[PDB]
């Protein structure tokens, strides 16, 4: 029955990441069971673009990419092939012709502490839309005007990143829903993640 891959600690990790700086983990050379995730679990919004979640275990691909991040509650439908908005156009540009299924489960027990939980960040100002699968870990001052501004704040010269305003009782509309999006790959290489 050989060895598995640590999907458990990928999902059961304590602190995942911020949205504008999403992580990666190349997963290969084991067996994986994409069945325990959907057969009986509390993961709401198990949308499964690409191939339908049924009969998913049998098909085998070369490598598996895992991406993780935290976003707002009501702002989860924007992360999909296409769609426009403040997200998915400045932080996570998901390309068309996508492969892989997305998991987005709600969480209000390890986040939004009592009082004010101001620790997560998301990019708010950018001069152009993101290229497919592009992450911009930058802090440089945005130039919104026609006059150079040298590391100062003022008119037509702002700060790119902004902090989330998660509150313990703000409402179901705005809660931190931890979202993990997978992917797939298959090219001229013997596939390894063939988990029956």
């Amino acid at each position, epitope marked *: 029955i050989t060895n598995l891959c640590p999907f458990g600690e990928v999902f059961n990790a304590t602190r995942f990441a911020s949205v504008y700086a999403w992580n990666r983990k190349r997963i290969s050379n084991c067996v994986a069971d994409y069945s325990v995730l959907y057969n009986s679990a509390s993961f709401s919004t198990f949308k499964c673009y690409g191939v339908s979640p049924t009969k998913l275990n049998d098909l085998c691909f070369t490598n598996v990419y895992a991406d993780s991040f935290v976003i707002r509650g009501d702002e989860v439908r924007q992360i999909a092939p296409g769609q426009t908005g403040k997200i998915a156009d400045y932080n996570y540009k998901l390309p068309d012709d996508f492969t892989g299924c997305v998991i987005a489960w709600n969480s209000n027990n390890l986040d939004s502490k009592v009082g004010g939980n101001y620790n997560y960040l998301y990019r708010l*100002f950018r001069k152009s839309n993101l290229k497919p699968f592009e992450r911009d870990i930058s802090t440089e001052i945005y130039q*919104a*005007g026609s006059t150079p501004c040298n590391g100062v*704040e*003022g008119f*037509n010269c702002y700060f790119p990143l*902004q*902090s989330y305003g998660f509150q313990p009782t703000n409402g179901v509309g705005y809660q931190p829903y931890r979202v993990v999006v997978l992917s797939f790959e298959l090219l001229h290489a013997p596939a390894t993640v063939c988990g029956p």
Partner: antibody, heavy 123, light 109 residues
Framework: QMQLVQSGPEVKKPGTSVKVSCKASGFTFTSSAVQWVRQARGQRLEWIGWIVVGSGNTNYAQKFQERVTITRDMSTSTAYMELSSLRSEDTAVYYCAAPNCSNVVCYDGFDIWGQGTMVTVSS | EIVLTQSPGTLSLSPGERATLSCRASQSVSSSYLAWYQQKPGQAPRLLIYSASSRATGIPDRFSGSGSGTDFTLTISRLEPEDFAVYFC?????????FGQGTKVEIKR
């Protein structure tokens, strides 16, 4: 055409609050800012502060650190101003300002101005 | 301190005038964030010149004026009879964005 719309006059009493709305239209309101001034009857202009419509930036005058909060709002693409504890010396005319910014580039001057409300505290 | 006092008290000349206006500031401000406003009594002010040496969307009579870190000026060559109102300085380089005293113009009879 592109313009700015402001609320109507109000009459209040000493010891209450007010609200003034700047319903921007005709331009991309998301990337802009609003400045608030206060003119008296034939006197010099003053300053009250400003907010960035991009949210998360307020800067008030020293003498008006308290008594005023500039809420922003985004659903109706307007801007609100609230001045509390109105006193007899606050009888004046209130204005509105913003730069004519259109997507790529923001115009560097407060080109557009509001019609101007009016408040009168009395007995 | 941060003040925007203006040298001329009032001006009174018939149509046709150099119309030199001075706006001597006190603290060093970079000549990048400064504007001039005109307020015809009975309505809201209008923007005339922004960023010291530039022009608005549209202005007649070719309003001109440029300065330095601690000195600015505005001149109106051949002052048109229609233009007669109060002119206000303004700086927004650093908080607070203190305004100016303002000057007044008139004709002679």
């Amino acid at each position: 055409q592109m313009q700015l719309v402001q609320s109507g006059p109000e009459v209040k009493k000493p010891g209450t609050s007010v609200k003034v709305s700047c319903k921007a239209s005709g331009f991309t309101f998301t990337s802009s800012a609003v400045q608030w001034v206060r003119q008296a009857r034939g006197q010099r202009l003053e300053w009250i502060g400003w907010i960035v419509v991009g949210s998360g930036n307020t800067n008030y005058a020293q003498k008006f650190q308290e008594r005023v909060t500039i809420t922003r709002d985004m659903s109706t693409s307007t801007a609100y101003m609230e001045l509390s504890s109105l006193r007899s010396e606050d009888t004046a005319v209130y204005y509105c300002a913003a730069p004519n910014c259109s997507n790529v580039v923001c115009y560097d001057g407060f080109d557009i101005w509001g019609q101007g409300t009016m408040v009168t505290v009395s007995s | 301190e941060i003040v925007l006092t203006q040298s001329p008290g009032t001006l009174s000349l018939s149509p046709g005038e150099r119309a030199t206006l001075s706006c001597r500031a006190s603290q060093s401000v970079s000549s990048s964030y400064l504007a001039w406003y005109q307020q015809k009594p009975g309505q809201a002010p209008r923007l005339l010149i922004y960023s010291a040496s530039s022009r608005a969307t549209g202005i007649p009579d070719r309003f001109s004026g440029s300065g330095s870190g601690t000195d600015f000026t505005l001149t109106i060559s051949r002052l048109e009879p229609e233009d007669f109102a109060v002119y206000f300085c303004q700086q927004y380089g650093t908080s607070p964005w203190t305004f100016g005293q303002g000057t007044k113009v008139e004709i002679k009879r």
